[PDB]
Structures are given as C-alpha cells and as structure tokens.
Write a protein that binds this ligand. Structure first.
Ligand SMILES: NC[C@H]1CC[C@H](C(=O)NS(=O)(=O)c2ccccc2)CC1
Length: 78
C-alpha cells in the first residue's frame, strides 16, 4: 500500500491495475515523456517503479504497452 496520494511511496512495485508493466522513467520507449529522473531528481524515479511525480491521486507509471501511455499502479491506499 501507499500513504495519502502516494507521492512518498518508494517501494519496488512496478505493475499497473490492468496488469501491464511499467516503463522505466529514464526510457523514452515506447512512450516519449518529460517525467525523467533528469528533470525530477528528487521524486524517486528509479528503474520502472510505481511513483507519483505530478501530484496525482495514486502511484502510477507509463506502460510498456505501446497503445496505453500511462496507468495507475495495482497498489491500494494504506
Ligand atoms: N499522472 C497523469 C499523467 C498525465 C500525462 C503525463 C504526460 O504525458 N506528461 S509529459 O510526458 O510531461 C508531457 C506533457 C505534455 C506534453 C507532452 C508530454 C504523465 C502523467
């Protein structure tokens, strides 16, 4: 689980609500993005782990499915 809106989550879960695999935050493939550890160095944007850099309502990630840009992660609110 994550606390509040999930901004402080730093666990190692990396799978979405539909069972897709999170793209790595430093990767531009399949989805080109601007939410990189480059730009957000203090948000825990390590590997492909579920995170919340933009103050969303839960941890999320861009997905490895080329047709689905981003999803919330299959974690529950503590
Ligand atoms: N938690 C919700 C999602 C909303 C889409 C968002 C995105 O795609 N942002 S971005 O790569 O900086 C970006 C922003 C504007 C134009 C191109 C790319 C990722 C986070």
């Amino acid at each position: 689980c994550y606390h509040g809106n999930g901004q402080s989550y730093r666990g190692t879960f990396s799978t979405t609500v539909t069972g897709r695999t999170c793209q790595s935050w430093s990767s531009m493939t399949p989805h080109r993005h601007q939410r990189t550890p480059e730009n957000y160095p203090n948000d825990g944007l390590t590997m492909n782990y579920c995170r919340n850099p933009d103050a969303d309502t839960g941890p999320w990630c861009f997905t490895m499915d080329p047709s689905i840009r981003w999803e919330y992660c299959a974690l529950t609110r503590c």
